Write a protein that binds this ligand. Structure first.
Ligand SMILES: [Ca+2]
Ligand SMILES: [Ca+2]
Ligand SMILES: [Ca+2]
Ligand SMILES: [Ca+2]
Ligand SMILES: [Zn+2]
Ligand SMILES: [Zn+2]
Ligand SMILES: [Zn+2]
Ligand SMILES: [Zn+2]
Lengths: 246, 246
């Protein structure tokens, strides 16, 4: 089975009109993993995959734009059980440096929070996930997701660090946050710009680069042109429905 | 100015594919009030009204399907201020029987939680709102919203009670939850069926009835036919984009 990644939502902070914030659907064969679960992500997700066919969720961090739809997901599982659609508890993986946030992940027998350990590989069906702590105003982890043949790296949210380069080494697809333009400094907000995303893809030898966690001003296509001044491979701008498959 | 109500989202519990859960936009002249703020509501809302033009939010209760988008709304206000779009704090009205939930409404100088008092009229620009406690598994308040010429009643979530009849007396539009079909009993879930919604519209003399908080099974048009076996006025099924204006 090939690894198939579908962007479900891609705005930073809050949704643009009729769009969504962070959510990425990773699929392999019958396995479905949702990476982050932000604003309007469930609404958009169910157009690709029904709640009962979702096998697991994993959360990079607990900012609203990455977890806003967890509650509604818990209710979706509850309604599924009430309608007889399967009682399998959906695992929701998250870090437990923030205990109060982690405790919200477990809802009756419908969803079960499981703490990932940042120094250990996590198995999720046919995927193996490893983690890198980001530089961000709350605890946040980037993820490297492989199925043994292809490898996708998701930066989650971060300002720039050299450690992203070894972490992302030889990734087929680097999904990098890019909340700021080339002229701007995202350090104080815990975000990166186009040049920084480009630098990671370049020095890591990423197969290609996908820019996401997008801003609500400017010409988004400029983020791609700016990234291409540094990285010579393929660079795309994320949108709901964007599909990568290898 | 006429009172204009736009349904932003109308599913109970969690969103159907490409839809939304509870959110209703009430407008009068330049004033904009959002009643409830559930899953995918911000995404859909911004297609009608940008965040910075939103004057107030009011929350019937703190179930996920009515508040999931509050966090992202707080970030939208923060990004608005960072971009220079106005620093006016958006008031978010809610009950304070649940203190922990009420405390989440205030975020820096961007949003400010204000406790409504259920026994007192609330002024919201040109609207006056009065409240009725519902029968629901968490504290919840129905709302009667008038501008002095027209009056809309929103049941929020509730199982049936006689007190809805005097509360909704002579409303031009009764927006009633209707999470269950005529053959089913919604009492143990704190919800109503089609016959119960119909009964309220009938005995209150409502100008018309709008059924919302919809289920994820069955033929939704049957809810309208069932309600019409009791109420002889106009009955519609809610959908995102539904507009009532008087
Ligand atoms: Ca599955
Ligand atoms: Ca390509
Ligand atoms: Ca306004
Ligand atoms: Ca009509
Ligand atoms: Zn973020
Ligand atoms: Zn963040
Ligand atoms: Zn509800
Ligand atoms: Zn409720």
């Amino acid at each position: 089975d090939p690894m198939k990644v579908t962007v479900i939502g891609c705005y930073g902070g809050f949704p643009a009109a009729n769009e969504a914030t962070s959510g990425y659907l990773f699929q392999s064969g019958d396995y479905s993993l949702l990476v982050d679960c932000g604003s309007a992500v469930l609404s958009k997700l169910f157009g690709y995959v029904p709640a009962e066919k979702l096998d697991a969720v994993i959360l990079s961090h607990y900012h609203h734009d990455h977890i806003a739809d967890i509650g509604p997901l818990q209710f979706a599982k509850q309604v599924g059980s009430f309608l007889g659609k399967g009682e399998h508890t959906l695992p929701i993986y998250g870090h437990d440096a923030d205990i109060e946030q982690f405790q919200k992940l477990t809802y009756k027998t419908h969803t079960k929070g499981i703490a990932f350990q940042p120094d250990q590989p996590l198995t999720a069906g046919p995927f193996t996930i490893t983690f890198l702590k980001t530089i961000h105003p709350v605890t946040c982890y980037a993820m490297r997701i492989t199925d043994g043949s292809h490898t996708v790296v998701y930066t989650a949210d971060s300002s720039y660090q050299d450690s992203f380069i070894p972490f992302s080494e030889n990734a087929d697809l680097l999904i990098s946050e890019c909340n700021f333009y080339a002229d701007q400094d995202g350090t104080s907000a815990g975000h990166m710009n186009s040049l920084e995303a480009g630098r990671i893809a370049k020095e890591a030898g990423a197969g290609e680069l996908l820019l996401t966690h997008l801003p609500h001003f400017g010409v988004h296509d400029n983020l791609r042109k700016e990234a291409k001044t540094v990285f010579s491979g393929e660079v795309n701008i994320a949108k709901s429905g964007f599909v990568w498959e290898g």
